[PDB]
């Protein structure tokens, strides 16, 4: 049904969310430093 | 300062985590019809 | 979707080949010296 390009798009968004959440968790001490 | 192989392994872990959620969702959907 | 599982699985297989080839390439470069 859903094209491969749409699954790839949705998977890409989920991957971005994972990566951005973990990035912020790691750099949260640096963000407080300002 | 992180290796290319490491970037690949970290991407692969995220992908594998998403895959396990989908596998479990499918297994539960079958099971709930008993 | 099981077509989502198929995609994810095939992407994981491509990534595993990319890592193996990348590992070999790096072992070749390290010896090129």
Look at A1 and C4 and tell me if their CB atoms are within 8 Å.
no
Chain A residues near residue B17 by CB distance under 8 angstroms: 18
* Interatomic CA distance for residues B16 and B3, integer angstroms: 20
Separation in Å, CA B30 to CA B33, C4, C7: 6, 16, 20
Residue B32 to residue B25: CA distance in whole angstroms:
11
Return the C-alpha torsion angle B31, C2, C4, C8, nearest 10: 90
How was this entry determined? X-ray
Nearest in space to C6 (alpha carbons), one of B23, B5, A24: B23
Could you give the angle at the alpha carbon of A16 between the alpha carbons of C16 and C3, nearest 5°?
60
Taking a C-beta distance cutoff of 8 angstroms, is the pair A14, B18 a contact? Answer: yes
This PDB structure is determined at a resolution in Å of 2.0
Backbone angles phi, psi at A2, to 5 degrees: -60, 130
Query: In A, residues 1-34, which contact C (CB 8 Å cutoff)?
Result: 1-2, 4, 7-8, 11
Is B16 within 8 Å of C12 when comparing Cβ atoms? Answer: yes
Residue A33 dihedral angles phi and psi, to the nearest 5°? -70, -20
Q: Tell me if C7 and A2 make a contact (CB, 8 A cut-off).
A: no
């Amino acid at each position: 049904s859903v094209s491969e390009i749409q699954l790839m798009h949705n998977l890409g968004k989920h991957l971005n969310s994972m990566e951005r959440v973990e990035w912020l968790r790691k750099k949260l001490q640096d963000v407080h430093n300002f």
